[PDB]
Enzyme design. Structure first.
Site, PDB file in Angstrom:
ATOM      1  N   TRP C 218       0.839  -1.376  -0.114  1.00 49.60           N
ATOM      2  CA  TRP C 218       0.113  -0.049  -0.191  1.00 49.60           C
ATOM      3  C   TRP C 218       0.819   1.190  -0.057  1.00 49.60           C
ATOM      4  O   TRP C 218       0.617   2.312  -0.817  1.00 49.60           O
ATOM      5  CB  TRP C 218      -1.032   0.172   1.219  1.00 49.60           C
ATOM      6  CG  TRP C 218      -1.704   1.217   1.280  1.00 49.60           C
ATOM      7  CD1 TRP C 218      -2.940   1.402   0.623  1.00 49.60           C
ATOM      8  CD2 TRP C 218      -1.478   2.443   1.947  1.00 49.60           C
ATOM      9  NE1 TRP C 218      -3.380   2.708   0.684  1.00 49.60           N
ATOM     10  CE2 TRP C 218      -2.500   3.369   1.660  1.00 49.60           C
ATOM     11  CE3 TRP C 218      -0.459   2.865   2.903  1.00 49.60           C
ATOM     12  CZ2 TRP C 218      -2.468   4.717   2.238  1.00 49.60           C
ATOM     13  CZ3 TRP C 218      -0.660   4.312   3.446  1.00 49.60           C
ATOM     14  CH2 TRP C 218      -1.431   5.038   3.220  1.00 49.60           C
ATOM     15  N   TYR C 222       0.952   4.279  -2.920  1.00 47.66           N
ATOM     16  CA  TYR C 222       0.410   5.566  -2.453  1.00 47.66           C
ATOM     17  C   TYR C 222       1.600   6.545  -2.571  1.00 47.66           C
ATOM     18  O   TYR C 222       1.462   7.570  -2.827  1.00 47.66           O
ATOM     19  CB  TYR C 222       0.060   5.787  -1.060  1.00 47.66           C
ATOM     20  CG  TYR C 222      -0.715   7.177  -0.986  1.00 47.66           C
ATOM     21  CD1 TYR C 222      -1.882   7.468  -1.460  1.00 47.66           C
ATOM     22  CD2 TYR C 222      -0.211   7.981  -0.117  1.00 47.66           C
ATOM     23  CE1 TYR C 222      -2.590   8.530  -1.190  1.00 47.66           C
ATOM     24  CE2 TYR C 222      -0.832   9.265   0.083  1.00 47.66           C
ATOM     25  CZ  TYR C 222      -1.894   9.656  -0.520  1.00 47.66           C
ATOM     26  OH  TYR C 222      -2.477  10.872  -0.278  1.00 47.66           O
ATOM     27  N   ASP C 238      -6.204  -0.425  -0.590  1.00 49.36           N
ATOM     28  CA  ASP C 238      -6.920   0.606  -0.092  1.00 49.36           C
ATOM     29  C   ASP C 238      -8.244   0.189   0.719  1.00 49.36           C
ATOM     30  O   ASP C 238      -8.801  -0.368   0.079  1.00 49.36           O
ATOM     31  CB  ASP C 238      -7.140   1.606  -0.963  1.00 49.36           C
ATOM     32  CG  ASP C 238      -7.766   2.984  -0.234  1.00 49.36           C
ATOM     33  OD1 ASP C 238      -7.089   3.559   0.450  1.00 49.36           O
ATOM     34  OD2 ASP C 238      -8.910   3.164  -0.505  1.00 49.36           O
TER      35      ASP C 238
END
Lengths: 281, 282, 281, 282
Positions: C218, C222, C238
């Site tokens: 993740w 991001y 997410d």
DNA sequence: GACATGAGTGCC
DNA sequence: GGCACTCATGTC
DNA sequence: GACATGAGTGCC
DNA sequence: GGCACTCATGTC
């Protein structure tokens, strides 16, 4: 005529029988009254012949002159193979019921960690009789013959198996990915990166082992048990073991087997070679 | 009790004399007639007394009741230390005029590679004697005492040394670096990264040992020679050795000893113990 | 003032609302009319003020005198922050209905790759408010203050976070493992290991980032989206995305998005700021 | 079109002269009065043109239509390539007499670290001229030819030189180690391992860079200079510099150059371009 | 002695 | 220039 | 049996 | 969220 001691009882029938099944042709000769196999300690080659003397709680061992020089080690490897150190009084006194039927049980070791590593890997997916055949041929191809005893041949060394033609091996009856796992392990041996003796932190060494190409959790375990004679392992990813713990998952098993710590290697042997066994309520 | 055979000649005075010089108090005991020390194999522990019989060129080993369960692995340990596999008619032949001074010359091994790993490290920079004094402190400090035999103490075990504070080891009389090394080596033993047995490819393996902090070519070579009883490794880096080829570079020296192949460990030992050996006046 | 224009539409009230939420006390100020923050580019420091001119499709960028010698790099930082390079005709005209309610949607970048790196790690798990509150703490302890702007403080640099005491960062209210993550990242920034600019093989890169302790999948995503403004990455890992696709799992989703390639990063946004959006069952 | 500022003095003659000499054909153009090259920024290609206005103390930047969406980043690139941030009063006033003769000297940056790596590599062992023709060939094969301005081809992207056959590159006129070097570089590039912007700890980064095959200490340095525009690196390895410091070895030089910290990069340029410069009597 | 490091020495 | 390889210093 | 996948689980 | 381990699973 050298001799070693063992604490009673000692189920030779079980021990030999077990070595027999897995005995690789040309290399090992297992008979109802003795075990004898080729052996190398560096450049010193010849033949070992253990002959248990159930009478005088002693294991007589004869050595070929080509090994007289390394009598000590030879004598030491044998002691690792037949688990001569074991004190059944302690182990069965810890397992109770479980080990109460065959108190003479012992952990079948090995006479060289590298041999076992190969033995392990080649034991994957196939059957025993099958594996002891696949090995026999592998020994046949890379094994040094004894000029003093043509009948016997030495297990392929790491350097002999390192300069191994993958297809050559694969052509002996194993996936290539298998023969690749060997050629690899063979290298570890050479550069002393493969623990040739039981290490202090076994959990580590095993995880570290599970990185070697071709070596998974079952192989790493079975290897720590047989190659390092590690007394507190268990194979919960083992075909047979799964059947003795119906439904139960590898985790459920590992969890369970904890009641036998610190002798899970023995609890294991008692469960394997004990058909019909089943967990409690 | 247990006895092991050997091939004559065997310079026991020389062998014992060598071991005694490096002996570590409370752990070993060397006399003119026998060698004796504490020893651990797994959890099994106790004492090994080794008495040679020159008349029968036989070594009689006695284990305390604490070791019997692992007697075999014990004898192996001893024979490795004493080099009973050595067949003088081969080594002395191939070296010739080199060791004919004393053919009974054997390669002193060890009873355990790890201990030898610790010994070769503290053996750095200092004199043989001083190194023996340090190892003593680390032993007295981190070693375990034997119940059956109060006087004796076992060598510091890997785990005990891993779980040891650099300062404490430093305080014993060694640079911090040296101490970080002891502690590093201790883990390779627990992780099984440090070979306890002579590996098929020494050369490589030694190279691998040098990636370790505190282990230069010298500690690698030496450890290889003692800890694994490697029989074809020379020490051009060694102190007394550079003094044996007065005014020479490690590569010319190492190039020199190539005639003593494949027993350069033995050719080395003959140079040391040859009061005044100066390279063949060619 | 300096001027940089953009291609309509451009939802500034949204963009600014976004940065406002993740605003970092003392490093940035955000009102409905403008954006402003502290900005450093080596030994050059000052305050950057950005004022959008929706009227004539242009963004005004004022620069504090300390940053004047590096105006270009300052404008490039702003252009990357506000995704002014974007063409809503191409993206929106490739997302269809997905991008129809908010075509003025832009991909929120950053002003410093490392900073975004430090932000991403801290955004881990906690909510936006806490993450921002948290980052404010780290800045307060390690950031440089401006002589011309006492109210502002520059985000901490790599030389400072790399030399931070794990325990001190820990104290600020974060798992030791987390602080060790910032310190490791800091070291990467010092060695040149942290890609400060969208790298050739985005996929590959992210895979190498995950090897950094503290950085999972993740975080490596991001960071790619915000840190390199990489336009083609989805985030089934997410939370909001997870539920935008109830029942669907990180493979079903990940495959569904394939339909949006290579503008998947925008897709991700529209689905995010579209409370009511359903896939095709 | 766009205008960027600069602090006086600014030796444009020297600067354009330096770029010109290393000008890669089909990629860039350099005339007494301006500098124009192809420029790719992702899926945006165009031609950048820079014209320095000595009177206004400004650099005029023009961009072909293809690059207008990434206009600012193109400016940022030009700024690095032309060292516009430099305040000559700081440097010269510290660099002392070393650059008193040509106070308008600047650090010739680049417009893309990767291109710069490729150029530092290609330029090894050969003359500035050969390097240019060498690179030119490379560009004319793996680069993207622009459609609006056919005489211009965008310098090869990572993924392109990455997939190049190590034999074509050899064909263009270079060894093979050299060619794998580019492919290695191109790879590091694709994965984010080649720093595209100046790294927090330059010395460290250079150390790491030298691990890359093909990249030694020189290349490693020359790259930190042009590619990251680091203002404090020296080239005690360069052939020319060795000639400027007769009889000294990289160590003495480097230690001598320490007198120019933290502006060693500039000192280097001054020395490089000074017919018969020579260190101080000793 | 371990280790960082400078220095010379050829080859591709 | 990169790179392999080997002396020779200089702390700790 | 090893080994990628995924998909879930639960301890930081 | 990062992660180490887990429970299938299809392949070899």
């Amino acid at each position: 005529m050298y001799t070693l001691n063992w604490q009673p009882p000692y189920d030779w029938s079980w021990m030999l029988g077990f070595l027999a099944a897995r005995a690789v042709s040309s290399v090992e000769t297992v008979a109802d009254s003795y075990y004898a196999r080729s052996l190398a300690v560096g450049e010193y080659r010849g033949v070992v012949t253990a002959i248990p003397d159930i009478a005088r709680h002693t294991l007589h061992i004869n050595l070929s002159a080509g090994l007289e020089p390394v009598a000590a080690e030879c004598l030491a490897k044998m002691s690792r193979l037949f688990d001569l150190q074991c004190n059944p009084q302690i182990v069965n006194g810890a397992l109770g019921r479980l080990g109460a039927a065959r108190p003479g049980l012992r952990l079948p070791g090995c006479v060289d960690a590298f041999e076992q590593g190969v033995r392990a890997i080649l034991g994957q997916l196939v059957s025993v009789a099958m594996a002891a055949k696949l090995t026999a041929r592998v020994a046949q191809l890379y094994g040094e013959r004894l000029d003093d005893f043509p009948e016997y041949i030495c297990f392929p060394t790491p350097q002999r198996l390192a300069a191994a033609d993958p297809q050559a091996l694969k052509a002996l009856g194993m996936p290539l990915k298998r023969a690749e796992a060997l050629i690899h392990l063979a290298n570890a041996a050479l550069e002393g990166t493969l623990p040739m003796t039981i290490p202090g932190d076994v959990e580590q060494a095993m995880k570290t082992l599970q990185t070697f190409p071709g070596i998974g959790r079952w192989t790493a375990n079975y290897f720590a048990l047989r190659g390092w004679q590690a007394k507190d392992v268990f194979l919960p990813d083992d075909y047979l073991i799964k059947q003795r713990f119906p439904g139960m998952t590898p985790a459920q098993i590992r969890r369970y087997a904890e009641r036998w710590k610190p002798w899970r290697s023995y609890a294991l042997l008692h469960i394997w070679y004990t058909e019909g066994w089943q967990p409690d309520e």
